[PDB]
Write an enzyme that holds these catalytic residues in place. Structure first.
Site: not given
Lengths: 239, 243
Positions: A10, A94, A164
């Site tokens: 990313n 995200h 994450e």
């Protein structure tokens, strides 16, 4: 039968034609494991450029998209446009979209459904806030986020889940194992065994081998290191 | 003299084939030399649009963020827009404010950054339907304009776009003129006489081939930010609204 190792890079809001051209040159010339599926997540403005310059074996991902093909949504792009450019993936949910831009689980779910219906692969991201981790509710939170995605997935073949954390390799393995257990119980044993769950915490050349050795870690969604030559070493973490 | 300005906001529409066609049409059209034309393309097509459009036609991004680089997955910066050869960004569009909840403060920060980086800014303002119905249009648009103006040093590269709210089934050129005259008066006293005289204030309501001449004849309307019609053949007629 085994899950193919998956490494996404990313780039976030970074790069210009010069710096990304240099990055792409390095990736194209590198000796990359045949056993790693590699995808680069480019800023929207550089998606076309990136797809033109990158070798076909490397996939290109958009960093976000919207939930319909067209309309009065100044500033947004759709899966149709992403496909038009030749990119095959989109990163959705995200942490930065959730926390800086306030994207809800409902909206992310709608985006996942639309992207999949349009023929894209989705890197679907989940992760709890720091206060939630500190309060001991990581599992409850990530299960809620995963359910919101799962309710919008009819076919898991083109989905990769990315965790994450807001972080130790043992802590990573613990969450990944719990996520796979969630898939087993709430979707199916087949989906649990086949779905890549990639780690989206801090991944460097220094820590990638240890992380990749964890039983339920299937690869990485790499942040800052994806802009650097060490991304090659991360792609090759199992070798 | 304030050069007539027509921006065409494609919003979330198009692909290479269809935008290529729309660009080919523009390149071959008899466009008034006295209109500054800018096309607002989806981010994914900005490079393409700049490659294909005649140099006389500008290219605008539809949004950007407030720093040159960083951990902002899904965002683009003025540095990237410049890198692609585009010279404008649309900021504060009604859809960014309403659908995406962009605040006056954030929009102001974006304006300051885009201008510092050398882009032109089409800075959009406009009240919600409920606000217009309550009769507080003036109050709202002045508040929004203040947030922009606090972040503008040099107005030479700013165009102000007024977007009246869509009626949704439940406006007139005179009503456009009234708001534009008020905005210019605001600029006169909050910035300067010179800035009020020179700043283009463009109309971002429903602009069509059928209403563009009447709108363009208004004393304080300097052009248009065109939505849907920018995807239609009549965009050429709108560019030529003064003639």
């Amino acid at each position: 039968a085994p899950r193919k190792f998956f490494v996404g890079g990313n780039w976030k809001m970074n790069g210009d034609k010069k710096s990304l051209g240099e990055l792409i040159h390095t990736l194209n010339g590198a000796k990359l494991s045949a056993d790693t599926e590699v995808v680069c997540g480019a800023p929207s403005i550089y998606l076309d450029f990136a797809r033109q310059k990158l070798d076909a074996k490397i996939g290109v991902a958009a960093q976000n998209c919207y939930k319909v093909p067209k309309g009065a949504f100044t500033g947004e792009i759709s899966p149709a446009m992403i496909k038009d450019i030749g990119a095959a993936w989109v990163i959705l949910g995200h942490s930065e979209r959730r926390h800086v831009f306030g994207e809800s689980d409902e909206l992310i779910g709608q985006k996942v459904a639309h992207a999949l219906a349009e023929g894209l692969g989705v890197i679907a991201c989940i992760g709890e806030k720091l206060d939630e981790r500190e309060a001991g509710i990581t599992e409850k939170v990530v299960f809620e986020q995963t359910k919101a995605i799962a309710d919008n997935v009819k076919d898991w073949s083109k989905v990769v889940l990315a965790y994450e954390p807001p972080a130790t390799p043992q802590q990573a393995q613990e969450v990944h194992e719990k996520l796979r257990g969630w898939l087993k119980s709430h979707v199916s044993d087949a989906v649990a065994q086949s779905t890549r769950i990639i780690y989206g915490g801090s991944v460097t050349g220094g820590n990638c081998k240890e992380l990749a050795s964890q039983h339920d870690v299937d690869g990485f969604l790499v942040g800052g290191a994806s802009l650097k030559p060490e991304f090659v070493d991360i792609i090759n973490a199992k070798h």
